[PDB]
């Protein structure tokens, strides 16, 4: 929920650290079409 995103050409980066990640918040949202992963399975993200 940033107000305005960057363009794909100039893509933004954030270092996320020293904090707790609860991806089940993101995965339990209906809001997304796309939530596809490539070295982990999304339900396991919380166990890690």
């Amino acid at each position: 929920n940033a107000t305005r995103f960057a363009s794909v050409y100039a893509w933004n980066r954030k270092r996320i650290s020293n904090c707790v990640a609860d991806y089940s918040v993101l995965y339990n949202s209906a809001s997304f079409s796309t939530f596809k992963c490539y070295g982990v399975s999304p339900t396991k993200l919380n166990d890690l």
């Binding site: 070295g39 982990v40 399975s41 339900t43 396991k44 166990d47 890690l48």
Partner: protein
Amino acid sequence: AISSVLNDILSRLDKVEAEVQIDRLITGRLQSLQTYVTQQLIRAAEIRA
């Protein structure tokens, strides 16, 4: 496979996305045993002789 460590697959993937990775490690480790047991069987014949 995405790891050499069996638990690092089972702690990162679900019960379907893991099976392909695990079957790679089974195939590789099993062919490692068939190599070793072939070497040692053949070697045994040298010691027997």
